[PDB]
Every structure is written in C-alpha cells, then in structure tokens.
Amino acid sequence: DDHFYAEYLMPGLQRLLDPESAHRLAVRVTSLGLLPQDSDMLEVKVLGHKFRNPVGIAAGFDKNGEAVDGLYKLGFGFVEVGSVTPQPQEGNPRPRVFRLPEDQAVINRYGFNSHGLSVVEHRLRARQQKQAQLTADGLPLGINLGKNKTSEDAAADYAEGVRTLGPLADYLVVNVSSPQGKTELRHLLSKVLQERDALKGTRKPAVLVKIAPDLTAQDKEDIASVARELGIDGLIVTNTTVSRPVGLQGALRSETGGLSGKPLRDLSTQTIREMYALTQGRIPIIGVGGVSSGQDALEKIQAGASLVQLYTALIFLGPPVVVRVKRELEALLKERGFTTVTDAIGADHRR
Ligand SMILES: Cc1cc2nc3c(=O)[nH]c(=O)nc-3n(C[C@H](O)[C@H](O)[C@H](O)COP(=O)(O)O)c2cc1C
Ligand SMILES: Cc1c(-c2ccc(-c3ccccc3F)cc2)nc2ccc(F)cc2c1C(=O)O
Numbered sequence: 001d002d003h004f005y006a007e008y009l010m011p012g013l014q015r016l017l018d019p020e021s022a023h024r025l026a027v028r029v030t031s032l033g034l035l036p037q038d039s040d041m042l043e044v045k046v047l048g049h050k051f052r053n054p055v056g057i058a059a060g061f062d063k064n065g066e067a068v069d070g071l072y073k074l075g076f077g078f079v080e081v082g083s084v085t086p087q088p089q090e091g092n093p094r095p096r097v098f099r100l101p102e103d104q105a106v107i108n109r110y111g112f113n114s115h116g117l118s119v120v121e122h123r124l125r126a127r128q129q130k131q132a133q134l135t136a137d138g139l140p141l142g143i144n145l146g147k148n149k150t151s152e153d154a155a156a157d158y159a160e161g162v163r164t165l166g167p168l169a170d171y172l173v174v175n176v177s178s179p180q181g182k183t184e185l186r187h188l189l190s191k192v193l194q195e196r197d198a199l200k201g202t203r204k205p206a207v208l209v210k211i212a213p214d215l216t217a218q219d220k221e222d223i224a225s226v227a228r229e230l231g232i233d234g235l236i237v238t239n240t241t242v243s244r245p246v247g248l249q250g251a252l253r254s255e256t257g258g259l260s261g262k263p264l265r266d267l268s269t270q271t272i273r274e275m276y277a278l279t280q281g282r283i284p285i286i287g288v289g290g291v292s293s294g295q296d297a298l299e300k301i302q303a304g305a306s307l308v309q310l311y312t313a314l315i316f317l318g319p320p321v322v323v324r325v326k327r328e329l330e331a332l333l334k335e336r337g338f339t340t341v342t343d344a345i346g347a348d349h350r351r
C-alpha cells in the first residue's frame, strides 16, 4: 500500500539511517526478495528487444549487480546495473549522499564507488541463465559502463567494459554526464561501437549514451550530430544536475554533487524534447528525471521517450511507486487516445 510506505516506513528509515546506509540496506533487502500484471498496452519493442513495461530502474541503485532479480520482482520492465568501473574504486569521501525530503530530492557525489568489472562479471555470469530467460520474457538487462578516476585512457576503460560485460548485457550505456568537443566525443564512441561490433558468440548489445541536463546549445547539437553520425542505438536523458533550482527548501541544497528527484522533472523532459527534435526522432530515447507518477511518465514519452526510468521516487515512495506509475500510465494512455505506449512516443512534436 502506497500510504504505509510514504507516510510511515520510508520516513521511519530516514530518521534511523543516513542516506548511504539506507541505500546499502535497500540493496540487501531487494536482493533477498523479501518483497511482495503487465497488460500488452505497456509492451515496448525498441533497441532490438522487447520490454513488457516501459518503467525501468535507473543506474545508480544497483551499482554492482547484487539485486537484479529482486528489482524485476519489484515490477521493473528493465534493470540497469551500476556504473561499473574497470578497476575497483572507493569513490569520494563521506558523507557523499544528502537527503532533501521537502523537495522529494537527493544530492549525491558518490564518485563512482564500484566493485569493478571482475566482480560484477562474476555475479552476472552466475545468473546468466536466469537472465537469458528474463530477457526472452521482455525483461532486458542494461549495464552502465564507467571509467576509473585515475585511468589514463577513457576509451580504453569503456572498451574493456564492452568486452567484459558486453556478452552479459542486453544493452550498454556510456556516460558523459556524471557530475572536450565533438571530436573527442566521436573518437570515444567510435572505439566503443567498434569493440561492440567485435563481440562474438554473444548477441550484440545496443549502445546508448547517457547525457546530463546541463548542456550548452552547442553540446546538444554536437551530441545529436555524433549520435546519428555513428549510429548510436540510443540516448538516456537525463542524468543528475549540478544546478540548484530556485525554490529548493532542503537544508542541504548547498551540497555539491548531482541533484535528482522532482526538482529535475521538467528540465529532464525539456531536454528530451530538444534531443528528440535534434535527432529528428531517429534515436530511441530513455527518459529519466523526477518520474513519480504515470503522468510524469507520459509527459516523458510524449516529449520523445520510448522508455522511462526512475530512482529517487523509489527512495521516498518505496516499491508501491513502480506499480502506481505503470497503472497510471496505462489509465492515462487510454484516456488520451493511445491504444499502446508506442503511439504516444513523440506525440508533442507531432502537431
Ligand atoms: C544516489 C544516486 C546515485 C546514482 N548513480 C548513478 C550511476 O552510477 N550512474 C548513472 O549513470 N547515473 C546515476 N545516477 C543518476 C540516475 O540514473 C538518474 O539519471 C537520475 O537520478 C534522475 O532520475 P531520478 O530523478 O528518478 O532519480 C544516480 C542517482 C542517484 C540519486
Ligand atoms: C530510505 C532510502 C532507501 C530505501 C529504498 C527502498 C527500500 C525497500 C526496498 C524493498 C522493500 C522494502 C523497502 F523498504 C528501503 C530503503 N534507498 C535509498 C537509496 C539511495 C539514497 F541515496 C537514499 C535512500 C534512502 C534514504 O532516504 O536514506
């Protein structure tokens, strides 16, 4: 029930623990399955895969692939693992996670705390068989690849992620947004796609680029330009923002890092519209940023998203939020004339 979690449970956990401790606890609980129907309307085919429902869990929750199965159990149409780095790295010194309850927002500067490719690969291979079945059933797995803080070759770091986890991923994600020109971007992504095309004995995973909501007009044109030029399979809009919107009440708003949650809701959707227009609706887009209801989800899809993802909403509303968003999205699609989710993609631009 939505009320119990929002009014009591989540608030209870927030007074007993600091955000990073709660995050780790959330992962334990989710991976153990101490948790507990998708219509055909929500089914989305894109990126060469089938998704029973368009609501996935965004990268950052399960950084080391410890709770994949638990996440699907919570109702997610797809799971995106970590932001995994080649070598293990501790990340920024603590505290590095801050709660903004009144804003239904969070601010983090984790710095890519990661177990590493070796560990995540081992874990994911251990369940490769189960995931194979999951994928076949419209529950794809995404893997977000990062790079080490001290690494010298960014492209080499990502490429290594493609080789090690490409065989295990349904789709891969390269960041360029965690809180440089059109040429440096083109070289990085071409080497990644080349490594992807070099894979064998495995189904080639789609490659998407995740961008920040903090981009200049030139940044968006360049990203759109390179994406179409290289044939990027998609884009994830949007990642956290460094800006602090006028109206933030949280006492920790002055904290450095990326802001997620409701404050990022519309900035995320507007970026989706802009990127969708710059790519002429030719590049599938996964919309993320402040999704907390079916309606927020529909606004992202109409702006141009084929799929959406959420994270912060789960932090304050808990598991029930996943069920509520899907239920509302379905009800709204009907009410607004769309026979399927696919029909609403890019509806804003079509007028
Ligand atoms: C605590 C935290 C950790 C995150 N870690 C990652 C990460 O490792 N890699 C990544 O690509 N995005 C990361 N993100 C960003 C989310 O994937 C997402 O882009 C952003 O939070 C917007 O969605 P939301 O408002 O629904 O949370 C993180 C976000 C939060 C709040
Ligand atoms: C409470 C919380 C949780 C969480 C989410 C879901 C659950 C959960 C999951 C499954 C079943 C029951 C539950 F309560 C438990 C705990 N995850 C986070 C992740 C990142 C972050 F920065 C902060 C948090 C915070 C926080 O406010 O400190």
Ligand SMILES: O=C(O)c1cc(=O)[nH]c(=O)[nH]1
Pocket (backbone or CB within 6 Å): 060, 083, 108, 109, 110, 111, 112, 113, 175, 177, 178, 179, 239, 240, 258
């Ligand atoms: O680990 C992190 O700091 C991090 C990475 C990223 O892509 N986004 C975010 O909000 N935090």
Ligand code: NA
Pocket (backbone or CB within 6 Å): 273, 274, 277
């Ligand atoms: Na526009």
Ligand code: NI
Pocket (backbone or CB within 6 Å): 166, 167, 168, 169, 170, 202, 203, 204, 205
């Ligand atoms: Ni694969």
